[PDB]
Amino acid sequence: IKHMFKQKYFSDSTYKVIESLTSATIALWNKVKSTMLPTPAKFHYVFNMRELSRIFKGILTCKKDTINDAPKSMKIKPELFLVGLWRHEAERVLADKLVNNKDKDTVMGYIQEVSLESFSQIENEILEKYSSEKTFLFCDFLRPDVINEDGIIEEEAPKIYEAIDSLTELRKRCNFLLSFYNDRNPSKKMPLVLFDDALKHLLRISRIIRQPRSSGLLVGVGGSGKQSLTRLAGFIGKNLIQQIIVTKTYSDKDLKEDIKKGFDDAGHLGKQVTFLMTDSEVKKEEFLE
Amino acid sequence: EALVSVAETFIKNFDKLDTKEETKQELMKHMGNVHLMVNEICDEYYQKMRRQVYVTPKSFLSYLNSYKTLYIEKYDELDQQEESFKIGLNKIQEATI
Amino acid sequence: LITSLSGEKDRWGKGAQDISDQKRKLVGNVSLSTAFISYCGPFNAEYRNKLAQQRFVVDMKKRGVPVTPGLELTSFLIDDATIGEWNLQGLPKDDLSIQNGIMVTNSARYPLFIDPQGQGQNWIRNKLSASIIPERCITTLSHPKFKDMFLKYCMESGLTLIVENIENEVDPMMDPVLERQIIVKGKTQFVNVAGTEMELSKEFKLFMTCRLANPSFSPELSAKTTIIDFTVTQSGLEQQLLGKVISKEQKALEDSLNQLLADVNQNQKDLQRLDKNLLERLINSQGNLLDDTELMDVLNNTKTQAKEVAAKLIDAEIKTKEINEKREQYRPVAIRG
Ligand SMILES: Nc1ncnc2c1ncn2[C@@H]1O[C@H](COP(=O)(O)OP(=O)(O)O)[C@@H](O)[C@H]1O
Ligand SMILES: [Mg+2]
Numbered sequence: 001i002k003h004m005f006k007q008k009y010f011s012d013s014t015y016k017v018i019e020s021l022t023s024a025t026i027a028l029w030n031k032v033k034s035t036m037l038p039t040p041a042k043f044h045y046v047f048n049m050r051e052l053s054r055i056f057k058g059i060l061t062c063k064k065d066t067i068n069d070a071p072k073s074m075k076i077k078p079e080l081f082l083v084g085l086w087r088h089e090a091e092r093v094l095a096d097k098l099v100n101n102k103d104k105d106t107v108m109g110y111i112q113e114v115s116l117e118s119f120s121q122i123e124n125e126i127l128e129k130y131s132s133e134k135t136f137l138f139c140d141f142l143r144p145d146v147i148n149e150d151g152i153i154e155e156e157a158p159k160i161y162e163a164i165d166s167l168t169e170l171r172k173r174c175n176f177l178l179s180f181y182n183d184r185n186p187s188k189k190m191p192l193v194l195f196d197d198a199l200k201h202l203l204r205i206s207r208i209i210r211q212p213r214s215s216g217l218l219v220g221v222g223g224s225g226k227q228s229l230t231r232l233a234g235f236i237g238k239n240l241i242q243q244i245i246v247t248k249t250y251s252d253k254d255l256k257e258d259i260k261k262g263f264d265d266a267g268h269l270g271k272q273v274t275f276l277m278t279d280s281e282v283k284k285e286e287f288l289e
Numbered sequence: 290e291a292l293v294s295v296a297e298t299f300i301k302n303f304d305k306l307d308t309k310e311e312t313k314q315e316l317m318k319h320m321g322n323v324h325l326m327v328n329e330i331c332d333e334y335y336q337k338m339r340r341q342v343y344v345t346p347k348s349f350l351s352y353l354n355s356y357k358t359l360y361i362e363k364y365d366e367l368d369q370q371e372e373s374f375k376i377g378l379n380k381i382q383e384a385t386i
Numbered sequence: 387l388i389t390s391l392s393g394e395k396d397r398w399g400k401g402a403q404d405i406s407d408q409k410r411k412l413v414g415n416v417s418l419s420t421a422f423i424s425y426c427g428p429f430n431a432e433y434r435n436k437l438a439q440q441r442f443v444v445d446m447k448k449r450g451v452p453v454t455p456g457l458e459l460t461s462f463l464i465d466d467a468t469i470g471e472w473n474l475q476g477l478p479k480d481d482l483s484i485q486n487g488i489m490v491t492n493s494a495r496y497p498l499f500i501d502p503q504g505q506g507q508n509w510i511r512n513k514l515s516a517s518i519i520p521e522r523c524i525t526t527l528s529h530p531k532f533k534d535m536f537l538k539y540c541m542e543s544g545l546t547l548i549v550e551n552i553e554n555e556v557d558p559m560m561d562p563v564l565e566r567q568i569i570v571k572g573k574t575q576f577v578n579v580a581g582t583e584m585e586l587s588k589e590f591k592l593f594m595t596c597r598l599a600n601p602s603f604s605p606e607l608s609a610k611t612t613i614i615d616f617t618v619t620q621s622g623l624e625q626q627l628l629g630k631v632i633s634k635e636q637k638a639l640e641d642s643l644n645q646l647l648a649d650v651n652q653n654q655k656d657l658q659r660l661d662k663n664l665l666e667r668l669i670n671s672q673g674n675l676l677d678d679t680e681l682m683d684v685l686n687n688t689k690t691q692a693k694e695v696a697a698k699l700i701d702a703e704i705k706t707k708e709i710n711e712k713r714e715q716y717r718p719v720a721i722r723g
Contacts, residue, residue, distance in 0.1 A: 196290055308413045323442060330433065340600055343607075343609075348425070355420045359416050360412065363416060385392060385395060
């Protein structure tokens, strides 16, 4: 963090929060790990030091230039911004895992309880802005620089990791990207409506697809919005979807060839690739190994 | 807010649904408030009778469809009656004068 | 004519005002019906009342959705004749099974039955007797060649296959039939089943009979198929037996009502001809309305039919009070039985 964010570029007030980040996430992580215990149900709850890596991975994917541009763009002090980014990435790692809505509201307490005490200098300006109810979400695709006039003629949109203040401002952008997917992929239509909770799930997926060396696992009862939001996130993210075709002829040998085509696309030539799986696509347990 | 937001898009797609714009906004909320009320009873039914009924977001998309199919059909019967009535009420009124 | 026509107008008016009022009330009426069909199936008789009459009806009045205050489900969704037909098929007279009957006809998703004793099965066997065949139509979930022998044949032909002994857990190869996802080429409607396309006709039907009291289905399964609890309850047999006692004891009273209602539904239809006949013939006739004796006759004849119907629908309402008093007096025999 001290290497990636240098004193030279930042204010003295911003950099006092950057030094706080590294001490803050640990205080939070100890509180969250002590309270949310693994059980027969809610087995995944156990928090490792992968879940520390993953917080910081998110924080360091927000560039020095978007933090310094928070007073113009987000219309908040850049030192204040930085706490919102922290709060977001802390939530996305820790709070998203959590299976029920009561366990979330406990953890949103710990993320606020820590953010006040770690960031004492901006305590009164954090406390008033940042709630669990109020949204301050992050996405690479916020920028509408992709006009899409006879394909992508106007360069591309720089995929910079920026904060969105309201879900309504995002919905206009996310509804536009949905309508454009249905144009580009006309054979497989995707009639979908982006309610506040689905938008939130799309960002969460289009974060996990956008971070390097970051797989996902979308756990939902079924018909929950998983596959549809994934293919949209993969479309928005300008990366190649791959899905296993289940036929009686197709076996564990043909999987290995479908994975090999994945590495032929990913490791060779250098294309981002987003191998998609479901309960249905897992014909036998050996495929999942 | 999700179920009501899904119910909002479905009523807009529904062109043959003829009612007040106020009433449609009350219906949107009701459609959603139904799908919660079933989940609330599904939990109650497991505590009182030890029977597990599972309702998913797919089972809400089924309700909304099923709603239109029975409405469209039931409106088609009613609307063609009211039109066979209304042809009457004009010609008879003229005959009375 | 002025006395007669104003009379004929006021019969038309009042019906149109009721049909107009019925369209205003339809938005709620359909919401309260279609909620019951999709969700209330898997619950017992007690909880279907709780989930519909105590929960949904309360929500409507608060929201201000226009709904008929009573809204008897059985009356609204299906005619009184078709209830009579299901009774002959062997769907019992009790309120729960009638509703279970309505859910099977109206559900877009393939109906699943919970019935531990095949009461729901014995009804869907007696009904659909034409489109069912005894041999090579009914199979169990697990068969050596379930797919190629039964399923493949019944789709191609369009015969109503009934899956036996589902035993809680459903096979994953069946999923794409239940989903009703169709890759349409012309009008064939080819549906892939474990990676093999099969010609599905529109006249194909599937019924899935669980033979367990309390089966724990998966949310994915419960969303694919409309679950209907067809289990015989003490409360349900009470309502069946109470029907059987009322058919035996005070038979003369109960039969005279069934004769009257059947002659009332006739005279509603008979009056719908004469008032129609006038409308058709009063446009065709045109000028000199005073001499038009063949029209004049029916305008006064509609009135005697409209007076007759009205006086049976008062006497019909009196006999429903009279029989419901006896239904309470003979309740103790049925609830004992
Ligand atoms: N907001 C929504 N509007 C319409 N359909 C939706 C919505 N959310 C989910 N669905 C439905 O979810 C179904 C399954 O897709 P999805 O839920 O993304 O994946 P999965 O099958 O893994 O649950 C689709 O048929 C889609 O119509
Ligand atoms: Mg599913």
